[model samples]
Target: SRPQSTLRRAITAAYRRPETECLPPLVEAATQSKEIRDAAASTARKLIEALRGKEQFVTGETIREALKRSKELEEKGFSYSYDMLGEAATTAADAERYYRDYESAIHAIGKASAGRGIYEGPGISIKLSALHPRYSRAQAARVMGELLPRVKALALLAKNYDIGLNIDAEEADRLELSLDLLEVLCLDGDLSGWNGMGFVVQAYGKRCPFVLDFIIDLARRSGRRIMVRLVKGAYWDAEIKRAQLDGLADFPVFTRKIHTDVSYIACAAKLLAATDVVFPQFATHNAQTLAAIYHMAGKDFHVGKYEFQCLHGMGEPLYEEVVGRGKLDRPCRIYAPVGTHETLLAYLVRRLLENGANSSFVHRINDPKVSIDELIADPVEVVR
Candidate 1:
């Protein structure tokens, strides 16, 4: 079947139609005939199966289960950053469970890494919200008092094992709070001299460059070359909705995809120039962005100059072309997500919303209508 046929287009549009406008007649018609019921049931079954299939996206539900999968990827020239997926904790028990999960993951990943250096070894990514039930600005005292120590313990373990441990980014509001944690971790005597301490910076945010300046300054001051993963912001839709609901003056993130694309290029330049103090990791699925950065990075590649990053299941093909010796001769880190079906919903929804967007590069690159020149157009010049 054609990928974008009239039937599929109509169904997608129908999904957005008001519930009251479409549900009653559809429900009544569905119950009227066995033929209609069978079709609907089968369609829904296939959809659920596709979504629940872990092989497409998730590595595994646990660290032990994910080890083999990651090793296979490693052999094929890809390093990994395993993410333990779950949302913000609502209870102390939930936060405890998540903390222990991180502890266990670090131990497993660290052991597997053996003597592989931080750049070559698999790393762990942790969400601050998952480590504390009240990881908000309002609960600053509790977060600094309670949450900081737990993070320190985990970082210490990671430091001892010689593997990277990155703090994952969340909503825009949590930015400052996370920065406070990062600053402390960077300067802590225990975490000193370890370059594996990493942080994610979302380029879609309006304050991306300013944040990078602060991080660069911190790295220089602390004498640790911080690992910085630069990404197009996640949670764009949620940011817009929250801003609208709160009657904010302006959106914290760019309103247009093109604007975000330009921001990514500009931010990439800033990160590239700061390579002496911070190791920049560019996470993207766009071939154009990859090529641009590849050219910008220049020819001399070493172990830790910089690296490209991609999602576990999504960016394999593009990265496959870039990772090997004769190819682009660059290192790529796979952002491998580890979670069960129960905990995969939020991550899955975010991925779908991100890659399925109309202006997304992944969505456009697959269409025959878009040309190479158009896809690779300079975002700066185009915006101008």
Candidate 2:
């Protein structure tokens, strides 16, 4: 799922923190300029204030609106996944608040839909860091222990009501820990029924192939199905810089983008081949890659085994065109983020910096595909 424009901007601010050294030297050079830096920062602050005044960003009510929107899309042969936007809480209290907010959302979805088809209507996308402070993995697990039961209850309600849930991947260091928590919750927490749970694995990670195989084997042994949401990953620039600054070796950041894309495709092929144990969700904006997966699956393959997924607000035309052909499934799920403008602005900025062309913010803005509407959208409002 994609976050609202405002949320994206807020995330970029954190990335801009001087300690991170995540931005490329060119971006630093531009931002460090006395006249430019002052102008840019002042403009950004004013924009954030305006967004706050508008009460934009995802909330319980916003999610309901998104559901209504998704229902409309479903009528047009599309489905959706819901993401309540917040990330990387810095304190235990903040983590607790995140968990509680999620619980409320889950409950609201259940009540609003009367627990019918909860798994199919729209599921949640969550970040591990949002469930606990950044440095506390164990504490995060503890928080998960307390909160997962609620998630499990929600999943049960979804099965009874007919909805599904998927966990999102964060930065590289947290990947394994996040997956571990998801595996524990799904396997031992008794929430695997009706495909109610899934975990994302980044193909850009050097160990992704091994991780996929492990999950595949685990699924087979447990006589349970595992859904894998595959993506090429989002934090390339920050990851590389962190590794370099820390003088670490063997970091996956140095891997070429082409290699990562190829790896993702290969892993996807393997998952697609295993109909019994794995259900693969191909999440991407690249038409070429999507077409490749379609060809690899063969014309006659069942649509249920593999479905195309995309971020909201980013690839609507492509999504429309793909489903319009009627060659594949009638409905494809789009991931939509709902949150306050402050949260969304942060998210947008992070996306720009991380995905910035050669680490240059100016260059990223110049790219034709990057949405200027989204770039300039009030951080607090939904892009739709």
Candidate 3:
């Protein structure tokens, strides 16, 4: 179900830009002073470590610990997706290494789920930038070309294990190249049979409807199932700020407020109605938007046709609500991020800096039921 026009308008109107004032003053000072930059980075690293530790409190191990919780969640009528949780690599070698790491994770998950009929975990989500450094798109593509064979092999392996693979979306600059690689892997004859390979499209991007049309056409031609993990872009400020800093004529992420929201819902509704091979993974926590999706689909729509997705360690009440209601009709997959405390610190800082005012860190800290100390003491684990 997609949001109604009126609700969409209200949500859009209510969507005030995140306040940058709450951020540490060093964040702005970092732009001008090397010392401040170092200090800010150091502080960010510490915060990330804290968040990662908190993540451990929930899952009790790194992402590889999915085997421990997958069955339990399945018994409770919920599914899971394994996410590696690091991004923004700057070099081709790093990207290639990241791809191999993905292959390794896929193999591990397949082996673990072999005899576990009780809970066949969903699949993996990957970011292309992590496969290569941001500096060289050509090099990234070349690295992807090299990794494609292995990726295809992993895809086949995943099918044998009954898992799916979804390539996550990133900032605007990488969208085109990411789509190119997704098309190559999905279109390749041997891999298509595996039936688990899918690519993501960010509805917040102004050009997404066009991309959606292209994907539909591609699906028709290849006759392969396509999964679209639809998320309202994560790097919104980064995208806009980067464009402004570079003196670009326009930002590709979003041009106008109404246009992006309307287009996103419209495209989702269209995909919901037209494509049989399409599976829309709604990645959002907005209650009204979530309700609208159900409304659009009507009571008759099968739950298996679409799934609700949410980030790990955020929005627990919402997650429970979606999974508790058998009406969802599709498997609900949660994106659980896993990594070492040090690595996760870097990731969390970037998230904070990117969102600045809208970050959930403050809320999590202030929540009476959520123990900050427990989070900081816990080890990373695959969350449900």
Candidate 4:
């Protein structure tokens, strides 16, 4: 190869190192300086604007006005689980602010879907941290004491509206705490009849298997059904850096992308097999995983009993083949995020990193010249 070609390849390899490591020397110097900081701030703002430009977000003056736009997808036989986009709150005021925004969105959607069928759930995902700023294991008592009632209030609202609400998953550190909250919510009398109240689990985490065990066992004992949305997690890089910085002995997430992919498929099998106690929702953009699910679910698969999910802006082509609506005879849910630009930035950034990584499924398949055979190869074989 030419000198130019060799140098570019080497540069690309360097940046792909885990974020927990220090940057390339020149970048480290630039990031620590005010001049670079000023430019960095501008870059940050530009990044959010670039995300907004993608039109992945659903928006309008109000949730009412904005949700009307989603009716467009219904025609295509796509169901939606709307998320009011906001980041982890740092202060009580911020948390309260987030809670109000969520409450408003839920009420508005409730009004719109009052007559909708159970198959078409009044689906919404809420982040526990947004309901209370001090959401942590250290504050587990506060989470259960203070945050539980707030979620209970929302749970009551979900019960009244005759729909399900999903607890959005966050970082690895919060996994246990999130399950603790789910335990209380799952047993609450107000939500006794609702199988719709549940939480998301990240297959990337080392605890994915046990976490599913906890959910299934709890649902069995409590005499209620639960929704389990499984995905290859976001925040892998952040989780690694935070663990390293805190001088932890090990990272909580699997270090290899292939490991996460394999774990995801294994977890998918467990969830599908537990069809009696839990509603399994597989949210992904990979053809291999979806194809694997179809084969695993078997020839007599029931579409309404289980479902698949994809992001709103991305995965249109994949969804068509996998979703097929009436043609494939399986249901597909679009995880649509809705909010103003300010509230939407953090969620947008996570999507960017998850999709932009060099080894990501979406990234690999986007190359027009890449072969379908290579794209759908087993992760174990491909990663090796």
lDDT of each: 0.78, 0.59, 0.58, 0.70
Give the Cα error of residue 80 in candidate 2, in Å.
0.8
TM-score of each: 0.84, 0.72, 0.71, 0.82
- Cα RMSD (Å) per model? 15.5, 13.8, 13.6, 14.4
Stronger candidate by TM-score (3 vs 4) = 4
Give lDDT: candidate 1, residue 30.
Answer: 17
Per-residue lDDT of candidate 2, residues 77-133 (tens digit)? 665677878888888798778777666666555555555443235667777677656
Top model number, lDDT: 1
Residue 322 of model 2 has an lDDT of 61
**Candidate 2 Cα errors over 4 Å, as ranges:** 1-61, 111-120, 134-160, 324-330, 353-384
Candidate 4: give the clashing pairs: none
Off by over 4 Å in 3: 1-61, 90-93, 115-120, 133-144, 255-259, 325-330, 350-384
Worst 10 residues of 1 by lDDT: 23-32
TM-score of 1: 0.84
For model 3 the local lDDT of residue 23 reads 20
List model 1 lDDT by residue over 215-238, tens digit each.
888898899899999999779999
Candidate 3 vs. true structure, TM-score: 0.71
Cα error of candidate 3 at position 231, Å: 0.6
Candidate 4, 137-233: lDDT as tens digits: 3467767788888888887887777666889899876876777778878777767776668679988776676577677877788887788899889
Tell me the deviation in Å of residue 361 in model 4.
1.4
